[PDB]
Amino acid sequence: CEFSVSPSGLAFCDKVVGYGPEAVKGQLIKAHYVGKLENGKVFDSSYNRGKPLTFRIGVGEVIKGWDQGILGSDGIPPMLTGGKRTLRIPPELAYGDRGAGCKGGSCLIPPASVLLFDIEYIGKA
Incomplete structure (x- = not known):
């Protein structure tokens, strides 16, 4: 899985190219995902939550x-x-210096964390 690095640092690898239409801004879509830190620790997943994440894409909901x-x-x-x-996301496009899932200064997602996500775009909601 060698990533293609975009100008912003956001990198991706299409492990399986979709068979349908491209995503469109404002659309409510369904996605399954697994999010891991660079050491391999899974910090969140649709699977653990027992359901896909349905949300509106391109409007700042994620x-x-x-x-x-x-x-x-x-x-x-x-x-x-x-x-x-698979996406490789630099902190600036994720949770930055703040981090996420914090308890005081200790966070499930440490400050300045690069995030790795395996995303399965199921389709529109």
């Missing part, structure tokens, strides 16, 4: 890396319905 990494951006083609994509 981290910038997801909006850009799924809808596409300079250097990043959009995901297609039914595709599987």
Whole structure:
């Protein structure tokens, strides 16, 4: 899985190219995913939550890396319905210096964490 690195640092690898239409801004979509830190620790997954994440893409409902990494951006083609994509997201397009899932200064997602996501774009909701 060698990533294609976009100008922003957002990198991706289409492990399985979708068979359907590309994602469109404002659309409510369904996605299964596994999120891991660079040491391999899984910090969140749709599977653990027992359901897909249905959300509106491209409107700031999720981290910038997801909006850009799924809808596409300079250097990043959009995901297609039914595709599987791995994203490498720099902190600036994720949770930055704040981190996420914090208890005081200790966070499930440490500050300045690069995030790895395996995303399965199932399709529209």
